[PDB]
Structure formats: C-alpha cells, structure tokens
Amino acid sequence: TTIVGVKFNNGVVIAADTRSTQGPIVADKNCAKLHRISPKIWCAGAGTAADTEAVTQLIGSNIELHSLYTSREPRVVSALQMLKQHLFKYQGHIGAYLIVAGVDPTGSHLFSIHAHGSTDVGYYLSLGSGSLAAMAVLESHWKQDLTKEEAIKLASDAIQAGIWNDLGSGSNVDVCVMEIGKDAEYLRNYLTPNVREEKQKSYKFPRGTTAVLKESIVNICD
Amino acid sequence: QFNPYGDNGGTILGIAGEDFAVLAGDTRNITDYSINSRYEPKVFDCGDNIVMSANGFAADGDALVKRFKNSVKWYHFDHNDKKLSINSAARNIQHLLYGKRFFPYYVHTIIAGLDEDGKGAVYSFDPVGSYEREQCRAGGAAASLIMPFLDNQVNFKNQYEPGTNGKVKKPLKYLSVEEVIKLVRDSFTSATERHIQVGDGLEILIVTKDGVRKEFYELKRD
Amino acid sequence: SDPSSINGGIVVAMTGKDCVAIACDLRLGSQSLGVSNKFEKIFHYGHVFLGITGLATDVTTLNEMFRYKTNLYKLKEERAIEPETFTQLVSSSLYERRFGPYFVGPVVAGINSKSGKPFIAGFDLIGCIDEAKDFIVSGTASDQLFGMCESLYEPNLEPEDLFETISQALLNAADRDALSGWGAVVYIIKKDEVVKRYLKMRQD
Amino acid sequence: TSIMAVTFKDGVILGADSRTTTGAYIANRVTDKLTRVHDKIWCCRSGSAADTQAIADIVQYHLELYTSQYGTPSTETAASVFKELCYENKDNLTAGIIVAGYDDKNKGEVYTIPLGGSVHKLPYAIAGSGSTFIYGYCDKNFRENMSKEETVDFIKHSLSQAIKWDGSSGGVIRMVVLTAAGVERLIFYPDEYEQL
Amino acid sequence: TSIMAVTFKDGVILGADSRTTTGAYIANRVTDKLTRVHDKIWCCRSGSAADTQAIADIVQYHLELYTSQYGTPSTETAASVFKELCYENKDNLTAGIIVAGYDDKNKGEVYTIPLGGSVHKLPYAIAGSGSTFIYGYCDKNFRENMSKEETVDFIKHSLSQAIKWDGSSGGVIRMVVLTAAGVERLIFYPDEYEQL
Amino acid sequence: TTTLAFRFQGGIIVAVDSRATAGNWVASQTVKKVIEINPFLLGTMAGGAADCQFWETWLGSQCRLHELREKERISVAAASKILSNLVYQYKGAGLSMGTMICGYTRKEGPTIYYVDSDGTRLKGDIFCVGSGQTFAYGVLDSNYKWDLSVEDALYLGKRSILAAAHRDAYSGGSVNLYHVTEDGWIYHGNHDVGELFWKVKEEEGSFNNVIG
C-alpha cells in the first residue's frame, strides 16, 4: 500500500494505489483505498485493511451524528481526535494507519494517524509499504504555494513511485481533491498504467469437457 | 542472529517437447518488498545443450550453476571431450546438491535439454537433490500458480472428450514450440498479475537439436 | 495446526454475462485423515449464496448464524436480502469478533433481483471485503485457485461456458492441494434459474 | 528526541528538535514537540508519541476545567496532573515530560517528570535521547537569571550539540518563550545551528 | 570508565579516571587505566578488564619484539597491532582502546579503536561509559595545537563532568603526557576537579 | 507417502504410491518410490525423498561392488545391513528414511527388511511404511494369505495402496506395483489412482460412501 497527501494553496489532495495483497499474492487488482469520513473529509488507509475500513466507517457514522447534532459541517480535527482516542484506547491492536485530509469551515487540513494513537501534521505525508519511495518524490518535488494541478501531479507521481518501486503497491492510482470552495472530487482510477496485455490464447473450453455426476435444480424462491 | 539464507523471489518454468525443450524464467530479482534488479537472468546455458536454473536464494543458485558449469568443463577435460547426457547432468546435480545436505542450496533446480534419443527432457531437483524427469515443471514463487494451469493445458488433466460424459479422456498430444511459448507467456503474465515477485521481463531459452536460442518478452513492472 | 488448515477445503466464485457461479470442494478431514466426503461448503439464503472455507465448526456456526439473521431480515423488511446487503452483513458480523475471530474465509455470490447485476465478493477472517468483478477464491488452495482463475477467465461468459471454466479451475486446483478434493459441487446462478452439479474428480 | 526548559529572569523558554523517527527512518522532520496545555504552561515531550500526545490532551482538558472552575492554575498544578497520569499508569506509559510555566506569583518554573512518574522541580531541565550528549556542556554553561538572548543562545547551542551527536534528533530547533509579555515561538534552521 | 586522549602542539596527553566497578560496587577506586605499551606509546582501556589487560600485555610483547628487531615502532604500528588483536577476536572481546603516541616525525597521534576492531585516527578521542556525557562539551571546547596547560585543563574539565554524571567513573583523574621532553604522570584528586 | 511389501508363495509383492508433498502442496505425482537397486533387489522410498533416493542408489553401487569382489549375488540381509550401518553412522544428523529392502535370493528365499533412519533393521513378512501405513496395514492384515496367487497378491497390494491414497491426504497420485521372484523383479504397471478408484468401486462394490 502507498498513500500520500499533499496540501495546495486552495485545499488538499490525497492519492493511493489499488492493489490489495494477501501476503505475496495480489488479492484485488483494483481495491480503492480512499475512504469517506464525511462528504468533504476523506482518508487513505494502510495496514490491516479490515481495521482501517471499520474504524473509518465508525468515525464517519459518529461524525455524521455529530453534524446532525450540532447542525454544523464536519471538522477534520474532530475525526482526527476521535480516531486517535479510539486507536490509543485499543493500544495499537487496531492496525490502521491513515492519511486524513479534508476541508471544513476552518479550512484545509492534512494529518496522519498511526495505529497506536499518534498524529502528525504536515503539508505532504506518505504512509504504507511504498511510503518511502513516494516520499522520495515528495521531498524532491514539493514546494510552497502549489496549484491544484501541481499538487495532483505530485501526489500521482508519488503513488506511481510507490507502484513501480515497491512490491506492496501497484495497479492504478486513485485521487481525491478537496478544494475550499467546491465539493470534493473523487477520481477513481485517475491513472491506469497497468493494463494487462492481451492473452496469447483463449481458454474457453468446449462444452462437456468437465465430467458431471448429477445435476439438480435448487429452488431459490419461496 | 545471522541468517545465511535469503529469498530473491522469481519464477521459472520448464516444458519438454517431442524434439525440443524450453526453460523460461522471470528476470526480476527482489528482496523483501523492494526490487533489486529488473534483468538478472537465472536461466543459464551450460553447454552441451543443457540449460539450467536454480531459483530461490540467488547466491546459492549462482553458486550451484557455477559449480555445474565447472563440472561440465572438467567432464569434457577428463573424458575425451564426451558430451554430457542430460541424465548424467541430472545425476551430477543430485550429487552436487546432496553434498550440502545439511547446508542445503535454498534453490529449486530445473534443467532442460535433449536426451540421447533426441527427445525433449526436463529434470527437477529439490534443494537437497531429489530429482525426477517430468514433462512440465514450474518452480519458485509463482510455482503454485502455474503448475495446476499446466496440468490443465499440457497433460490435459480433468479434460474429457466432449459429449462422452466423462468416459473418454482428452487425447494427449505433443505441443509445438509455438504452443509451449504461448503457454509460458500466458503463465508468466498471469503470475505477474497475481504475484508481486513476478514481472519486469520473461527470458526463454529454447533448446533444439540445432542449439540454444533466446526469446525475451517484456512484463508488467508493478 | 493452523486453524484454517486443520479441516481444509476450497471455494471459488466467478461471474459472466448475466450469470454467476460458485463452486466448492466436498472434503473434510482431520489434517492428514480424511473424515467426510459430503461436507458441502456452499449454503444459500434466499437467492444469495455463501461459500465458507476454513475451520469446519466455524463454517457451520456462520451458516447457522447467517440463516438466523437472514430469516429475521426477511421477517422485518418483508423482502429477500440482496447480495450487497448480505455482504455488508457478513463483513460486520465478522468484524464484530475482531479479537476473537472466526477462522473462516466467506465468499458471497448472487444476482441482484432488482437490477440483475451479477455480484460476487470475498472476505478475510476479520471481514475485509474484497469486491472483484472477475473471480473470488478462498481456501487452502487459494494460490492454485488464483493461478487457475487468472489464467482461464475471460469476462462475459455464458452459463454453460462459465460452468466449464470454474469447474476446470476448481478441479485442477484441488488436485494440486492435499487438503482439498474428495468431490466438488458447482452452482450456476441465473436471474431465475439456479442449477447445482456434482463433479467427478480424483478421490486422493 | 532532545528537549529542555530553562528559567531566565524574565520567564521560561522551552526548546526542542523536530525529528520523530520510526527506527532509522525520519517519519516526520517538522514535528512540533512543544505542546500547549495552558496559555502560559507548555510541555516538552519525549518517548512514545501516542502516549505523550494522550497525556498532553488529558492534561489540557483537566487544566481547562480547572480554569473554568477555580481560575488560572499554577505551573505546579499542571506538573502534578502530568505526575498523576504518568505515575498511576507507569506500567503502560513510556513518556518523559518537561513542564514549563510562568505565573506572576512564582515567576517561571520548570518541572521534569521522567519515567515512573517522579516529579522534580529544577531551574533547568533536559531530557530525551540527545540529552545524554549535552549533560556536561549545560552544567558548564548554565547560569541563573539569564537574559532572553543568552538563554536562547544556551538552549540553541545545547540542542545543536544534541542534534549533531544523536541521530534520533534533528530537523529545526523550536523554542517557546513564556514571559509576562506572553508566548513567543522561535525557529532556528539547520543552516544556522550547524555552523555553531 | 571515562578515557580520552588529546593531541596538542608539543605532543599528546592521555587522561582517565580510576573507578573500576563490579556492578554497583566500586571494586577498585585507584585503578591505573593508563597502560604503557611502549616508552612513548600508551593506551587508555575501557571494558572487560581481563580482555583489556590481555590485549595490552600482548601488544607490549609485540612492540618489545619490534623494538628488538627493527627499532622504535611508530604510533600507527601500535595502533595496527591493537587493531589486529581486537578485530580478529571480535567475537570474544569486549574492549575499547585509545592509543596515543609521540614520535619526532609525526609529533603526537591518537587512534581510537572501539568494539569490532575498527581503527580511527583523531586529533582527540573520547571513550568509556562517561564519554557520552561529554561529547558536546569537548566538541565545543576542543582546539588544535593547544598548549600543555590548556590540554591538561580541557582533559580535566571533560573527565570531571564525565565523573560527575557517570556513576561508572570516579576516583582521581590520571594523566600521562607524552612529549619530546619525555613522559610525565599527573594526578588530580576529587577535591580539585569537583570545584571546576 | 504409502509403501507396502509382503512376501507370499509367489514371491514378494511391493506397492507404492507416487505423491510427494511439501505441506499441503503436492510437489509431484510422478515420483518413483520403488528404487531398482539391481535386477534382483528393490527398495521403497518412504520418508525423505532425496535421502532415500540417494542412499538407495549408493546401496545399489555397493551391491555391485560386492558382486564384483565376491563373484556372487549379495544377500538381502547384507544389503539391508549395509544401508542400516550407513544410516546409523548418519544417525542424529537429520536423515529421515523408512525403507524396505526386498529381494529373492537362493540362500534366503524371499526376504524383506525394514530399515529406518533411527537404525532399526527388522526382517519381516508384511511391512507398511509412510503416512498412510495404517490403511494399507488394515487392508492387508484383513485379506492376507500366504496361499495367494500372484494375481491376487498383486491386486491386494494395489487395493491397500488405493485405500491409503483415498483416506490419507498425503498419499496418492498413482500406484507402482512390482513382483519379485527369484529371477528378479517384474514391473506390473503404473495405475492412476483417479481411474483405479472408479474401476475398483464398480467392480468390487466398495467405497459406497463415495458417489459416482
């Protein structure tokens, strides 16, 4: 997994790969890792995928309840504090590492949360297996006062570095942009550089190839 | 604390034909979740129409290949430049491997060539030298992913004649060199798709009664 | 001694043109010793199908619990549960025991009654949803099934062809696994017709 | 991690580095290791980032409630809150915290709490991984009732030596000055303290 | 144990403490941690007393034989002998040795050899348990081509701070000055360097 | 792995499977677990694959050496004890081999020896070694008779290997069957377990629990 977040002058972008692996085996070649805590607060996950998904959904539900209670737009600091307190409560046993970006009434926010309950703030962040490779791109190409397209390109290039030079990442690149004045735009498969080449032969078997002992219709209706 | 063994990934496959043999392997060499090289060949021509690969610990593989090449050199020197038969090479490799029975070469070995009758031949060796001649054999990381596929398309396993209701099995045939090349490329593309340690490139050595030729094909780099 | 490898078994689901398929092995054994050749792993709730691989007792417990939950769901909503809703239910039920997990690998398959969309999904022992459109695999021969599927599959398969493909994949993966085999079943699920066929394979 | 707090005639100054590393990889090189628990009561944290952040958040909550109920807390009160949280949960916490405050009654005060929850009031306190490398220098270069400029220089030199020798420390030197005039944040970049 | 060696314009000076402890008990409080391997080549020892003593005895034997055969050895030669003995037996040795010598050609030289047998030539070298506490001070107070008095003062202050902070060091500060004039042995008692 | 050997009036019957596994992954099903030591001596490969194969081939070389030195066929006891002494010299070093050396000599008649990596050397009449030794033992001990014909003894060995391959998960692939008389050994074919199961089920009326 390779996830990155980059803040630009008018908001924040996050990006991730789309390769979920069960050990050395690729389980899903198009697993979206960008989750939605709130309509304009998103987060990329790494580590125990089930733990990340579950804590993100729980904090998103509680944040939606909080917004319906306070009649105010959700805030990134609130999701940050709730995630951090829960993770610290379970003493890192929830193996979730998140890069949480968002736009709220207070502005743009980009943070990172670790499984044990620590949080970091920065303009560019990277987490996951390829987090080093992506970071190599970031530290090489990040500057203050980035434009939207500049930050998008930087995040996509960091994710591409994680895809090419890290065995834990690959496939496509998902992006989510959150600008101050607009809605959040979730570009699923923003870049698809790993299209599979056409197979050398078709393996459509001639019907009747498999030996069948007995067939019986099963009534699914009631 | 010093572990004298390491894993470099990789996948090799050898298919024996009627009048030819083919030994192919991915050109990717890795360590943990990082890529060490995208073209470090492991399928070597050792002369006398004998191609050899020892996939696994790259150091042990290189050592075993070097020792076998030296053994072929000394065999030519000591026995009137007699050509080394593939079965003789297999027995010599068994003895080489079992020499380090208690410090095994952490490599699965596959050699390919032509037998004394001019037929294609492939021999497989476990790390300590248990050897067997087989029609098709894959070894390495994606071995578990390729060996069943071969059973379905090389030996026609579980494939029965259409319309015979599983009474008559599929008639076995000798696949052409083009067919085995197709099958090898499809196997390696699928391995690149589903295995993180396979990709970058596929190098095929084809041993016919006219000698050894090469065929290189690009693979996905994720 | 691995709780997922004491009893053994394999399940694989695939999709095609307006159809899905879900297949499983029929083997149950105490490691080396094979005990039962009639342990089917594909259960059905309404028009959704669930194949569970892993520790057999957890498989049966999950089957019973999900039957319970789907029955209560139908009694409350007065409608049959859809594959996506059941997938979410399986994920939530699995994660509910995150620190005391069920050593299983559920796989859901079906066709959405209202939209006709073929839908398959997989899970790990803690409920991580793996929603692939091509195929989902689980069991002791997960790697062999992965190879067979990534090699044989091509999208938009008719039921009679998807059956052959999934059956060949399951058989050639089970013959490469010592803890899988002893029979196999394949369900071909269409919008209004679901057929179940027992396969003939090696009993070793 | 290299942290310190020094009391000078006008108040107190906390100083720290900005390098938080997971092993040998610099996870964050712009970390703000100076945390505010009250308007003029700050803390330098060392050790488990999660533990230190949780302790600081709980102390800030308790001090906000104390402010709302009984007025401005003394530096000693924040020190005791930190001490309670660290000592009672010593078997599950890995945090060493220096607490520096300024109140017109007691001037400026510094309390260091190492592992175990012990609390020690000191004129100047140093802590963290790099502190071991500047124990001598500080003891040879510390004076009481210093001025703002010389106290900043002392903290800068100490943290520069700590960063130079301890690989676990680095980045930029951040200082927080608590005086009657208020709270001032100073930053010194590597191109400045490396040439010292 | 706290040991160091400093090169000044007239030659070199080795300095050490005198506290050898078996655990928390001060086994010997008058230990002579400065050992002579040649007339103007000495070594400061840290670590396993048995290992350091055996290494020093074997080095003294080899240097005596070198003197008998090929004349007076260079400081680098004794450094290389120490390096061989430590590196080849790294799996069975726990010793860190500083070697300081004076020869009219190269003036004074200092070679520190830590664990593992690596040899590093330095203008001034520090080692031992207390060294970690004086890494900063020394780097801030060391200068090249100092005078004899200034070198003695530098070593005295560094070892005094190390003794103050490191409990494994203590006793009296022992120094050996190697110059063209010869070998001088200096001792400084606690009642002197504690007030520094 | 399941290997069996038993002596009867017609000679010796040897029957092995062909499955080699590394855990749950069947590495191969074309393994030859009967090692043709020489035209008169056979060995069963149960245990460590490379260990058994290498050391039984070395045993064959030593038997050829003995025949060159003494101008006389080596006795089954002699070769079995050679292998036993070798493995005892390698005892504790990590070898794992449970093999049966079977032969038919003029002095000894039909003779079967069990030699294991622990140095145990046992002359016997009915021996089963491997993960599925229990199943073949059951079948044989139930249906064994010294007065069996060559055909019936061959079928009994094949059926015991079949039962083992069915129940045992680590045994399977194919059945290799050998018949050893005084004039040497005779190969009686390689029978694929997949088809042999259905044939035996239809002809024997057995394996009723399985449906086909």
Next chain:
Amino acid sequence: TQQPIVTGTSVISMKYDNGVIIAADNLGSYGSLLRFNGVERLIPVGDNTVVGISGDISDMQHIERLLKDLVTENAYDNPLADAEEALEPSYIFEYLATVMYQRRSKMNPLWNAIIVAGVQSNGDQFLRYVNLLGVTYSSPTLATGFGAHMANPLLRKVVDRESDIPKTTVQVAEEAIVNAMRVLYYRDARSSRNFSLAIIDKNTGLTFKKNLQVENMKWDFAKDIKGYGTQKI
C-alpha cells in the same frame, strides 16, 4: 562478524552514457550515535574502479586492505600492470563476491553491502552489487540500505532501462545523485550532510570529489507547523 558495531549508511550508484557514478556519505555511526565524521566509504582501485562499502566499518577496512593487497599482487611479475593486464572492475567484483559468499558459507560473514562501479577496458560500464549473503545483482541503478528504498525510484526515473543509459548525460546523472543524497539526508536518521562522489568516465577518467555537502534544503515550511492537530499557536 556476527553483529555490526560502527556502521556505514547508504551507498548509491547509476550508469550514464559514458560511464558510472557512485556516492556515499562520510558518517560512521556507533549505533544511534553519530560518532565519526569524515569516514570515506568510497575506495578507488586503479583508474577504472571504485568500491562503495556500506555496513560494518571494521570489515570495510578489512576489505580496503584486501583491495590494496590485490593491487600489490597483480603488480607482481606483471610488466603489463599498466595496460592490458591491469585490474578490471569485473575482476575486483568477482573476487569480492567470492570472498563474501565464502564468508557467508563459513557462518562468519563480512557485514557489508558492496557496490563495485567502473569502466572495463573496452569502455563498457560495469555496475554490480554484493552483500553479506553473497547475492549478486546488476541494474542501471544500484543502492544499499535506505538508498535502495528512496534513491532507487528517483534514479530509475532517469534510467528505467538500459536504453536510457545512452541518453543520460553526466550532468543529469550527477544531479540525480545529488538529489538522492539530499533526500536521504532528509529521511535517513543515520545519514550525513557530508559525502563523497566518484565519477568513472571512459573518456574523462576517475574524478573523485570529497567533502561535498547537501545544499538547497527546504526547511522554511517548518515555521507553519503547529502542534499535532488541534493546536494553533
């Protein structure tokens, strides 16, 4: 050697149209302590080979002595030590790799990762790697430690395949190497701002630059970072 003591961090190297470039920091770390500076980890052998060693510094000095002895032995009874019969990079590599694999096989390895970079007699660029396990691999970009994780992506963006080597200039390769050194200094706790860099060009020869420093560092944005989430001052 069973446990490294004084350790050397990353080493980086790449190929360009006319040769190779290698670089390494000048830091000897005593674990977490940045104990020694000015420790040269690039060892030149002749006018066509540079060996970059990362790991146990004692074993690095042992390899230095071994390389010097190899040069001395190749000088013996060799009137062509100046020309055809001079030490080629491939010879030095293969020797070091044999030594490393032997030390591994004896359960007493040289705790090092070595990158041999040079130009052969025929002008071909030689870049190869060995480690304490004896593993050998060659790629247009090669790095050790954190180098292999961070510098390799940046350097591969310049030369992803062999076909990119003829197009890459010496200036591009040197700039990429300097950028990789800066990135390592950013995100490697055991890195040093002072490093050394060797360029082996089949035409220019061996250029060895010592005492180089990381320049043009971006640290201003650190002033805007406040707290770890909710804090503002």
Next chain:
Amino acid sequence: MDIILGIRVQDSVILASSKAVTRGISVLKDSDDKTRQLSPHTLMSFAGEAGDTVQFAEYIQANIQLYSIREDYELSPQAVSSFVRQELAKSIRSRRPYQVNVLIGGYDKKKNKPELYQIDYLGTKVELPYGAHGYSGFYTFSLLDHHYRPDMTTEEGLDLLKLCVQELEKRMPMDFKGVIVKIVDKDGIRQVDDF
C-alpha cells in the same frame, strides 16, 4: 487414546467403545462403559480428556432428559446432534474448553432410519455411515470403506466391527481391554453380551 467406533447398518446403529481407562502406568479399569443413553432411541459414546468426557456426557444427558420430560416427546437424533454441536462450539472459545469427542447413534422413528453423527471437541459434526474418534479411524476406515454395504444387516455390522477390533488389537501400541458394543434400533438400545 480411547477407542470410539460407530457404524450405521440398515435399521440399526452399532457403537463400540474401549473398556479400558488407564491413568499413568496402571490400567485403572477394564470395564468402562464410555456411553450415555441420551434418550431411549439415542445413545452417545464419548472419549477424550479425563473428567471432561463424563461431565459433558452427563450434562448433555440431563438436558435431553429434561427436554423429553417437558415436551413429552423424544427429540430426533439430528436435533440432539445439533444441540451437542452447539454446546461444543460454545465450549471451544470458553475459558476452559471441553476436549471431548462424541459419536451419537440414534433411530429416527419419524423416518424409521438409523443415524450416526461424529462430533469432535471443536464442534465439527458429520453424518457418516462409519465413524471413529482418535487414531482408531486411521485403521478402521480402510476396512470399512472396502467391506461396508448400505444394505448391511445388524449381524453383518457386528462382524465388520469385530474385524475392525481385531485390526486394532493387532496394529495398535495400546491394549484397550476389549470393547463394549451397543445396538440402537427401533426397539431401543441394547448391549451385546460379549464381543
């Protein structure tokens, strides 16, 4: 361990259980009935950890008897097997789980059919024509798979169990001191006088 065998012949279920309980190097008893009559037409044989077996068996027995008294009705063998499987599945993840393996043999009067269930200490239930717990199966199955016919009579099943017991007495490293054999049919549960 202890020998627990079961076979399902036409209109009957035969259960065999070792008579030996040995703690240490001394065989404490050679006449142990490792079965519990759950209901007049359902018997359960048990083996495993000392103490847990008898406790779990008597607990299940009490529960089944209470159900039969409350509803004035005998639960089908399938229902009893499901109940025992749920009990064992709840046990496996408890503080101290039950390490007991059971064979349930019953005669479903509603179907007039014999039913045999094998359940382990983990809660793995299977309905099989022949079943065994422990190492016993490792031998017995090989015989049964060959000599079992679905239309077998009760005497044929007894002879088959005798062959299995002979094989166990030959190739087992332990002397289980014979077996107690019980037959469950439409007329209830009876004990073979001598096997």
Next chain:
Amino acid sequence: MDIILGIRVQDSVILASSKAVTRGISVLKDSDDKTRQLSPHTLMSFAGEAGDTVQFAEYIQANIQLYSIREDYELSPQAVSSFVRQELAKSIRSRRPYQVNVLIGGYDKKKNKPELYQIDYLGTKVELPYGAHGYSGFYTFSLLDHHYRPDMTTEEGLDLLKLCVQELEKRMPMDFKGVIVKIVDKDGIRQVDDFQ
C-alpha cells in the same frame, strides 16, 4: 518401554523379552527376539532406543566371540558383565551415547553357578536374583520379592515369570505381544517353545 525381565534360579537363569517392536502408532512386528547369545553359556537381553540396542548388542557379541576365538576359552559371566559395563560407561560421556539397558544371564561353569547382571545405559551393574529394565520392575519386583525362593527349580522360575507376565498384561498400558523366554544353564542357552 520394552519389557526385559530376568530371574536366577538354583541351576539356571531365565530371560524374558518383549516380542513387540512399535514405531509410531503401528506395531511393526510381534515376533522380535530382543536377545543376543554372547557366548555358549551367556545370553544378553537388551532394550531402549531404536537402533542403538541391536548395534550395541551385536558389537558386544562380536567382541566376546573374538575373545573366545583368540584365547580358546569362554569368559566367565562376571568378565562379560564388567566388559559391557565399561563399554557403556565409556559411552555415556561420548558424543552420541548408547541408550541401551541390558540383562546378562550366564552360568559360570568354573563355579557351576547361575549369575544374573542388570546394567543400564549409564553403566550401573548389579548382581541380583531377579532384575528388570524399564517400568517392568515397578510391578514384577513386588511379586518376586514375595514368591522368589533361592532353591527354586527352572519350572518354578518359569511359573513365576508367567505370573509376572500376567500381571504385566493386566496392569500395563501397552501390549508387548507376549515374551520370548530363554533358559541359560550348564548345557547352554535354549528357547522355551511356548510361554502363552
């Protein structure tokens, strides 16, 4: 373990040895003779680790036969017992010791007296009227201590051993598949045709 029993009657020594060899969960053989005729008037029964038993027994047999051939004389049972005890005592401190327990039954023709020796894998030799190796003694002794009389005939000793075998077949968790019984008297070593 394997059952190894021996009794010494007025004019004979009777040895009982298990017929069962079991590797794993399968009894490989039910007719195993766990004895080796060392000399025409001296037999030795053995039990213990697989392989070591037969190897040690045949080694002792070869040595005793070589001595009897060289000196044309049969060594007394005491000499053979001392030799095997010395062999086992040398074995215990070797790299891979012999884990074999033996009972030696002989008839000293020079004394015309029966003699029974018990030796374990450690080299602990004792001359006893009745002896047993393994758990067997834990039962058999209790019988023998009551039912053994020095003037017992060979038939009385056989009946006593049969009673011991019955008790073992009753209260042992193992089926040793009967015992092979051998009688050593003035006329040599003979085997009882049937003992059950």
Next chain:
Amino acid sequence: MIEHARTAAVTHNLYYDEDINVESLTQSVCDLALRFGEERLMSRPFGVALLIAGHDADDGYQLFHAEPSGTFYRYNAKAIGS
C-alpha cells in the same frame, strides 16, 4: 589395482548414471603408477602389467596395455610377459 579400477567404475556410474569409458578407466589406473617414493605415496611401483579390454559407445571395442610407468597404449593386439 583391480580394486581401484572396480571402485572407479562404480563411482563414475553413481556420479553420472552411465558406464565409464575404457580409456578413462585405463588412465585412472595408470594415475596410481608413479605415486611412489619416500600419506600420498607408496614404497615401490607395481610389478605387473595389465591388458585392459572393454567396449564403450564412443570408441567401440578397445584394448589397452597399462605399464607401471603410468603410460598406457591402445593395441589392436598385445602380448605381455615371458
């Protein structure tokens, strides 16, 4: 000499799963001849000549004369002795 020749033949068979060539066997035997002198040496050279006949697939039928001089010759017909 005969023992060494037999051992070399069977060892080449074990190592290469093939029959040793006649010339190779004759050379291996001759290699022992000059291993004499004053434990890699013996007291005296051999006092016997050998006619080594054989057949291999490479050179067909072959006859060799092997002397204690370590030298061997291929004869179409050779007589040695009195």
